[PDB]
Design a protein around this nucleic acid. Structure first.
Lengths: 122, 209, 56, 120, 114
RNA sequence: CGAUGUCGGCUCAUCACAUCCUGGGGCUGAAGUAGGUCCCAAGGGUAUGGCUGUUCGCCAUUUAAAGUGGUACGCGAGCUGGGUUUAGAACGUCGUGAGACAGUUCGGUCCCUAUCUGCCGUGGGCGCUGGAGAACUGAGGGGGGCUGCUCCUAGUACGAGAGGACCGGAGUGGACGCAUCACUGGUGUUCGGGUUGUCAUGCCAAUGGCACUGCCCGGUAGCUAAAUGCGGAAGAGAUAAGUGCUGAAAGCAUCUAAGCACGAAACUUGCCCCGAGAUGAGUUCUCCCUGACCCUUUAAGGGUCCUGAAGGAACGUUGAAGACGACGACGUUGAUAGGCCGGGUGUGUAAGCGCAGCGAUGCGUUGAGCUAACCGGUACUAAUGAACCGUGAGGCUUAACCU
RNA sequence: AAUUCCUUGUCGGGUAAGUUCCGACCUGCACGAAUGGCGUAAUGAUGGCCAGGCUGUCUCCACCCGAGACUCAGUGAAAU
RNA sequence: ACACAGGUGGUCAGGUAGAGAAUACCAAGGCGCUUGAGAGAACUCGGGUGAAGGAACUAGGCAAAAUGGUGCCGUAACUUC
């Protein structure tokens, strides 16, 4: 589901165990986030050596949710433990130097399409 | 444009090699008998009078039987006079079936809507309920957004009320043709058809360009 | 909020012009007796369908 | 509306209806005729006919029936010898419903419900 | 004339091996992966079974370390290829959704001995 | 002064235009991409949270617009009680004092079964002119009409140069309206299985009654959005601002005077639905009936008999229809309701038997047993003959033609 | 500050932002010593605040079971 | 004032579960609440079950839901001990 006040883990490195979801945005009456939908997020525990700081608000995309992704054929591919990737708002693409979990290729919009070009087997 | 009167049965899936299962609404055709052929004699117009399939007719009245005698020897379902457009539609040659869908891929389907009883407002008309919280009682789902102040004095259809809805003509234009087989007398479309199993489903090709 | 004028004796009749729950409409005939009964009901004397049942 | 509900709701709670129909269906075997209401009597066939058809199958493992559904303590000594061998063979239709109209000066649809005593 | 439960059987397979809830299936499926056709394999036990028409489905749970992946499949799919039915499982229910709540040795299914 | 309850919020829209987004025309100090910015128009469209009672003001983050306004400065026989607000009381201050502050803080009550207009749905009477059954025209009405971001059309147009766009599309998101149960989860007290307590069944196996359906878990039929599908068209007609031609009054000049064209996201027809009480009540087809007598203070009434068609309804078995009526099936020329005998989804292999076992219990017979809606067969039980309503060719005037 | 005019002060921390929370500033327009001043534990029908646990309060309602409402029948009130 | 859920002091006590005079089921004993039959509607009052998020709701965790037994372990700061 991933909605307001949701506390979840980051898929990029240096983000630490906890970040909070603070409205979906992008249109009228926007509630809940699906795989590859952009949500607004706040950083709370990030590692001192990382590019990001506490209380500075960013854009992120859902990479793990139990609603999964079904766009390719109608069969649902699902993920355990809600998680998001951190997106650059100006220069585009993800902001880390590593990525956690096995990930997915359905994240195909050109502003984050670089995710298939990383260390994962996808 | 003539309607083929397909009846409601259900939905199935049909697949492709990319694993996409392709859900499609099923309609099985029996087509028209053709039972009058009007030309010029009444108000200059041309009209076919289609008649669909066959029925048992076990208790018919003489006002119906005297018409079945001039229609043929087997009694069909419905009537539908179907007025023809000049230089656009014809009654000549062989009677037509699913060749109506050989290149036109959008359709329209008329049927009869389901009965909503009370109907109300907060389900049918997308209205908000009042909350049972903060010591609030007695009026949670009861309609009451009907005026101001004394200023309105007369009511327009943007205001919504309870009362019987359903059991009348309803038409949909959302449907896209996925597969047709003239030898299996089959029509498959993407999207859902209104009301109950059986019924009528008048079904004709789209006239929007 | 409340009644401020009494409804007329014409309005009384406009609300009593459909008051008959039973007319009462014609009866049905038996099959072994010169008797008659209510449509799809046995008489209080037991007459129905030529059976004469549960009589008193 | 009532979505898919096809059984009628009558009078009293479903728990009271359960016991009233249990008590009426078992007692009709000894009374032969009961006087009651038409809507109630039209649902009695749904429980008193399968209680008679219960004696159609013969087995030492069929005598422990009428103990979890439609209990009666006295038919279980006679019904299997009396109606099981020839009457229960017809598997239904054992009942007659007698529509009698009014009971007195009140509004209740009065009915008598009886069991057929001879098949030919 | 007559098309319900019949037309969908034209897309149904000519043979599939027989299996029940709790069985260890090992399913192989065709994938294009945004580049090139490959045969992919998925291991695990069936926690809910298919029984109805063409699009009836079954859920497979990896369970070999009590954790990891879970995925749904259809036996009449044109991209599902083959099924190993590598072991029969001993279970006493129709649904095994409680195996999504267990993750230890309590998630173990025994051999059916069919 | 015989009471139009106090501020904001939620619910709910609706009207204006000095137009916010959309369109139409234009000047730019507009070479191009952007930007600055004025006429013309009301079809379609215009944000949520923090402290705070506060809408607001401030802030955080978002827009194509979060436009400027009216609506008892739109909110109680609609709601909450926080602002406001007494009678408990305090802090600060003032007033000998009793009291006082639209200062401050805790605390402090929220009543209402509708007569009629306004409305929504729905019966019965009357009109449409012989009765009956039904399908078509269409006076007129409503619905549809908006769009962010990016990619392509296009490094093409322009311009040292950097940079970088129209038409028309697609990819991805939304408002709003509209429809489904195939997906998928949930629910599912008419289906199945497990289990705690206690009473009943002599007791035990085993099964009920009650305990939030005692508790726990699946789930058919069906609902449902937490699921899925879909949208603003061409031809023809006609329209402010604007685009105008030929041309006078006023030799020229001019869109106007005589004379005649183009055209907007708007609009009529076209599509989708309603609709002949359209008392201006239209059309056409299918079906039916070919009768008399008595009396009178009668150009009209009251009585009796022959003979009632085609059809309709009651009365039933009830449902895709339902608050009640209405209305869809079926009434033995029958599948309408119930039941039986099965199948299917669903549950999970029982109560027994055999063996093994101290025994709890396991395994085999056994994919057992059980069932409701889904699906099939069946007249097993029930829907009686009739009775009832509906009458005998259907009022008045005119024209022409054949006679 | 329950006391504060500029004041919803100023500044550090806590938020995405905080007329509120904790602390520091002194310039207390008017705290202050029984008219009581400062100070701590268990406790308290105690005002304010931070985090977690647990949750249909909410996202957004959806289905299930009764009573009153509905239908007829019985015996039959009120303001106005 | 009503065949009015209100008020009203003393006296006795049981299976099983339970620490209990709470509470579930029940025995002895008592009783079926002095209008009836149906329909299965919104709506009101009362109940039941609920996915994935979680206080975002709201002035405000108000309200509701979860927890809840016993035995054996384990036990912080603050403190007037």
């Amino acid at each position: 589901m991933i909605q307001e006040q949701t506390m979840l883990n980051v898929a990029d490195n240096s983000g630490a165990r906890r970040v909070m979801c603070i409205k979906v945005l992008g249109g009228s009456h926007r509630r809940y986030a699906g795989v590859g939908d952009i949500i607004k997020i706040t950083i709370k525990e990030a590692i001192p050596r990382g590019k990001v700081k506490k209380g500075d608000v960013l854009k992120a995309v859902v990479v793990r949710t139990k609603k999964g992704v079904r766009r390719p054929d109608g069969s649902v591919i699902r993920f355990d433990g809600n998680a998001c990737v951190l997106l650059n708002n100006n220069s585009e693409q993800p902001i880390g130097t590593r990525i956690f979990g096995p990930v997915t290729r359905e994240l195909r919009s050109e502003k984050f399409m670089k995710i298939i070009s990383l260390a994962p087997e996808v | 444009m003539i309607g083929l009167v397909g009846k409601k049965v259900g939905m199935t899936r049909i697949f492709t090699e990319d694993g996409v299962s392709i859900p499609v609404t099923v309609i099985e055709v029996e087509a028209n008998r053709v039972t009058q052929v009007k030309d010029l004699a009444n108000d200059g117009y041309r009209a076919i009078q289609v008649t669909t399939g066959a029925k048992k007719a076990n208790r018919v009245t003489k006002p119906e039987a005297g018409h079945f005698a001039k229609a043929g020897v087997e009694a069909g379902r419905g009537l539908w006079e179907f007025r023809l457009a000049e230089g656009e539609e014809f009654t000549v040659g062989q009677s037509i079936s699913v060749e109506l869908f050989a290149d036109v891929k959008k359709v329209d389907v008329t049927g009869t809507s389901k009965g909503k009883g009370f109907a109300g407002t907060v389900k049918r008309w997308n209205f908000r309920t009042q909350d049972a919280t903060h010591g609030n009682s007695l009026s949670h789902r009861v309609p009451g957004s009907i005026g101001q102040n004394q200023t309105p004095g007369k009511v327009f259809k943007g205001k919504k009320m309870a009362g019987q809805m359903g059991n009348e003509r309803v038409t949909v234009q959302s449907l896209d043709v996925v597969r047709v087989d003239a030898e299996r007398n089959l029509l498959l479309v993407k999207g859902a058809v209104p009301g109950a199993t059986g019924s009528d489903l008048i079904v004709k090709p789209a006239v929007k360009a | 909020a409340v009644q401020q004028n009494k409804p007329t004796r014409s309005k009384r009749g406009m609300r009593r012009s459909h008051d008959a729950l039973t007319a009462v409409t014609s009866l049905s005939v038996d099959k072994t007796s010169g008797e008659k009964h209510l449509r799809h009901h046995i008489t209080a004397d037991g007459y129905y369908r030529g059976r004469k049942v549960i009589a008193k | 509306m009532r979505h898919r509900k096809s059984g009628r709701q009558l009078n009293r709670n479903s728990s009271h209806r359960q016991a009233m129909f249990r008590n009426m269906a078992g007692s009709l075997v000894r009374h032969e005729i009961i006087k009651t209401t038409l809507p109630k009597a039209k649902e009695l066939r749904r429980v008193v006919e399968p209680l008679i058809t219960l004696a159609k199958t013969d087995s030492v493992a069929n005598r422990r029936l009428a103990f979890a559904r439609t209990r009666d303590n006295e038919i279980v000594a006679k019904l299997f010898n009396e109606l099981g061998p020839r009457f229960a063979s017809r598997a239904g239709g054992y009942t007659r419903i007698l529509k009698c109209g009014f009971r007195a000066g009140d509004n209740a649809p009065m009915a008598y419900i009886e069991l057929v005593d001879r098949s030919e | 004339s007559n098309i319900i439960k019949q037309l969908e059987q034209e897309q149904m397979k000519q043979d599939v091996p027989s299996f029940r809830p709790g069985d260890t299936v090992e399913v192989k499926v065709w994938v294009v992966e945004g580049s090139k056709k490959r045969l992919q394999a998925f291991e695990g036990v069936v926690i809910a079974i298919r029984n109805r028409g063409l699009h009836s489905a079954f859920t497979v749970r990896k369970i070999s370390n009590g954790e990891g992946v879970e995925r749904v499949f259809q036996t009449h799919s044109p991209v599902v290829d083959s099924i190993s039915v590598k072991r029969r499982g001993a279970v006493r229910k129709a649904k095994l959704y409680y195996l999504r709540e267990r993750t230890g040795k309590a998630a173990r299914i025994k051999e059916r001995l069919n």
